[PDB]
Symmetry: D2
Subunit: 115 residues, 4 copies
Amino acid sequence: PLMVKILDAVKGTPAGSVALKVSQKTADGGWTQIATGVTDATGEIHNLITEQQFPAGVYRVEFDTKAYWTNQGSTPFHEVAEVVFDAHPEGHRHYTLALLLSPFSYTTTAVVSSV
Amino acid sequence: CPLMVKILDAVKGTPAGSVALKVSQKTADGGWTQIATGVTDATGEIHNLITEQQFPAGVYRVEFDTKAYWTNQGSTPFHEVAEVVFDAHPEGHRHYTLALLLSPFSYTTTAVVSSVHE
Amino acid sequence: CPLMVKILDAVKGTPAGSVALKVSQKTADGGWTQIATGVTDATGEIHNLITEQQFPAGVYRVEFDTKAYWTNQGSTPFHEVAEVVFDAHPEGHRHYTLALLLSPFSYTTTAVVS
Amino acid sequence: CPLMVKILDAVKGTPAGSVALKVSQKTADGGWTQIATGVTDATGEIHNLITEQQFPAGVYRVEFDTKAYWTNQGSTPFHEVAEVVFDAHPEGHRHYTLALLLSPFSYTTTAVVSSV
């Protein structure tokens, strides 16, 4: 239900080996970690979480973009890239977090399916 | 397919369906010749736009009718068209995906030339 | 003005006015301390957000309340908030401009460091 | 000034200096006529590109030589050129700023319309 697609805007290829963590907002406004992972060579993470593990609520996906740029030989601006959103996964609704990376800029977009 | 597109609507958070586009190749005299037309499906893609034979190295222009798209959505668009002009290097089984992120007053054109990082 | 913002609305093609934001600084023990808050003017900027005195080297977080912006515009947005997190080296009259381009289901954050 | 540009380099985190551009206006037969050329300064801008008299309503094309820009940076660009094509409506003292965010394999073109 949650997918990601990370692209490297310098190389024109997906951003491989990007570390990320998924957190779910708690009642008191805190966070609980539900999953971690690293993108494969296609800039994706398969079976990141499951349907039951992804109920309605506010989620935060943290992408370790600083490490990605360091490993590519660039010095980036951002310490991390965070994507924070309300999820309503009732039925079919799947979420794709697309992320386009440059050393001093990123674009975060979402593709949300209907039912 | 050597040339794919992926168009997204940043207002709705869905792929941009029914976006018309045309692909042209720059000729020897400096002009443009149209080699394909198409319209995106509901996934924001166009399958089998052109074949390998139709896509030798050269300069290509892909023109997307974004103005009509936004007009149909009931919005007010800025651009008359979105144009993506590039020198194609298909050698070494290199395939192109033209990603386009649309907002009425903005678009982002990105190219993906490998399915994997390196 | 060593920390500036420029917020644009990609739907309307105008700066995004009245966007609430807050600036925090990372502290010794890893938490965050809020050092300023503001609301963008009609030009999508906030003048005199912080002073050089308030902006020593360190990690900073600028949180933009984009959800409220879209709700007010009549749009149903994706993000709860837009967060920009970065290490700052202002120690030298070094200017930071955080440019933010907003759409209901997308934003672009870029930095111009002078 | 009715037509301004602002170009940023998303790799370096600075404005993109020395970017060559050409402004053309669409003619009645669907052709183009060149009305101005220029190169961005260190702030990624071009002052006094055209006058209000030279900018009536109509379709304009601004062509940015991004390929040369990236080639000169020692990078490998995707795009052969960046073109921004739009119908200008400057009536009621509306001015345009063409913002352009450049990366070797991606760019973002946005417009800011202001009553200045």
